[PDB]
């Protein structure tokens, strides 16, 4: 609805900065609103779920399983690692780890993950593999959140993300078992909490997933819908603002809030 683009327009008019989003129709792939689709935004976290989306082809291919423990010491910690940090003892298992990775954002457990598939570069070879030539990664945690202005090394834009989640969560390419574990990792997310979770109604489904990056870099990635059950993606980026984590928190919110009001 053109009221939500209203609200993102005023969104980079307070944040001083460019803000970057897409609704998409999850069932039929149809673009319903955007504003800055087709620009490049940094991804910050918010690529641990496409990570994981290459972890599940490799357990559906034989290549990975689940249950394997990962063993790591202190040399792998990196900032910002609540869950790993606590397993230096016994290591954690695959799914542990995009639990940890999607869940907590953790990222030491992300780098854990990113070496079992062959780093940045398998990660970016997985995605063009699946129609998506648009996103990259290019570097590890925590350099791959730098932000640096016009660089386009880790990322992605609205349309290549939604368009790509998408696929993820509703095409042939993963098992429905492994599809529901990806969702079911993102539907437990408990760091988004003010992001589009405070927005939405009782009732509601939401899997997401956020992102933090440096220059103000913030955005997020949600399949969200009524009764329960997912029936569009959205996606939002920003990135160059000076204003506060709160500041730039609640405008997504707000973002959030139009959106589900004009359903
Ligand atoms: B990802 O969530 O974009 C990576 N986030 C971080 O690395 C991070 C750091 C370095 O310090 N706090 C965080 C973080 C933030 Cl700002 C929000 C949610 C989870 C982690």
Known sequence: ???????????????????????LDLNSGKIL?????????????????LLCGAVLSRV????????????????????????????????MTVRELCSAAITMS?????????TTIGGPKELTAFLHNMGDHVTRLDRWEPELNEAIPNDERD???????????????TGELLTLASRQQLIDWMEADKVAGPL???????????????????????????????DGKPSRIVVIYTTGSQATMDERNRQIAEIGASLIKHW
Do not use: C
């Open 33 to 49: 609103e955007s504003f800055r689709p087709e620009e490049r935004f940094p991804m910050m976290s918010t690529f641990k779920v």
């Open 196 to 226: 589009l979770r405070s927005a939405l109604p009782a009732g509601w489904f939401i899997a997401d997933k956020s992102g933090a990056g440096e220059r103000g870099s913030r955005g997020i990635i949600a399949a969200l819908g009524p």
């Open 60 to 91: 559906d291919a034989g290549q990975e399983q689940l249950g394997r423990r990962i063993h790591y010491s202190q040399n792998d910690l990196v900032e910002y690692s609540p869950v790993t940090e606590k397993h230096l003892t016994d290591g």
């Open 1 to 23: 609805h053109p009221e939500t683009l209203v609200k993102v327009k005023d969104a980079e008019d307070q944040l001083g900065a460019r803000v970057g989003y897409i609704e």
């Open 106 to 114: 953790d990222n030491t457990a992300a780098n854990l993950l990113l």
């Open 155 to 169: 990322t992605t834009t609205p349309a290549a993300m939604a368009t790509t989640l998408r696929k993820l969560l």
